[PDB]
Amino acid sequence: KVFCYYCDREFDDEKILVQHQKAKHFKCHVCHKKLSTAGGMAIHVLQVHKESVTKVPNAKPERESTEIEIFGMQGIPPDVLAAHYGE
Ligand SMILES: [Zn+2]
Ligand SMILES: [Zn+2]
């Protein structure tokens, strides 16, 4: 259907994808608040808990940067779409 930039898992639709992203990638490890982006998560952890997060949780090592803004399928670089749908 669609796939997650961070982990390459497939989902039947974007709504399900967004919930998975919030749960597995944008969740604060200390309090479990679900933020809306990986950047948002890292800023939360820092500001609330004073901890530095530089890797997205549960992500492939090449996808682990907090700096790219991914919302469901929105923001995925065209190269990564390519690599996923063949390779
Ligand atoms: Zn994922
Ligand atoms: Zn928290």
Numbering used by the authors: 10 to 96
Excerpt from the publication:
To unravel the structural basis underlying target DNA recognition by OsSUF4, we carried out a crystallographic study of the zinc finger domain (aa 10–100) of OsSUF4. The structure was solved by a Se-SAD phasing method and refined up to 1.95 Å resolution. The OsSUF4 zinc finger domain contained two C2H2 type zinc finger motifs with different folding. The first zinc finger motif adopts a canonical C2H2 fold containing a short antiparallel β-sheet followed by one α-helix; instead of a β-sheet, the second zinc finger motif contains a coiled-coil. The zinc-coordinating cysteines and histidines located in the β-sheet/coiled-coil and the α-helix, respectively, and coordination of the two zinc ions are very similar. In many known C2H2-type zinc finger proteins, neighboring C2H2 motifs are connected by long and flexible loops; however, only two residues were shown to be embedded in the junction region of the two zinc finger motifs of OsSUF4, preventing them from synchronously nestling into the DNA major groove. Notably, the first zinc finger domain is enriched with positively charged residues (R18, K24, K31, K33, K36, and K43), forming an electropositive interface. The wild-type OsSUF4 zinc finger domain bound to the substrate DNA (5′-GGGTACGGAAATGGTA-3′) with a Kd value of 51.28 ± 3.68 μM, whereas R18A, K24A, K31A, K33A, K36A, K43A, and R18A/K33A/K36A/K43A mutants all lost their DNA-binding ability. Compared with wild-type OsSUF4, Hd3a promoter activation by all single mutant proteins was significantly reduced; a more dramatic reduction was observed for the R18A/K33A/K36A/K43A mutant. Taken together, our findings suggested that the positive residues within the surface of the first zinc finger motif are essential for target DNA binding by OsSUF4.
OsSUF4 encodes a C2H2-type zinc finger transcription factor. OsSUF4 comprises two conserved C2H2-type zinc finger domains at the N-terminus and a large proline-rich domain at the C-terminus. OsSUF4 physically interacts with SDG725 and recognizes a 7-bp DNA element within the promoter regions of the rice florigen genes RICE FLOWERING LOCUS T1 (RFT1) and Heading date 3a (Hd3a) to promote rice flowering. The C-terminal domain of OsSUF4 interacts with SDG725 and the N-terminal zinc finger domain of OsSUF4 is responsible for DNA binding.
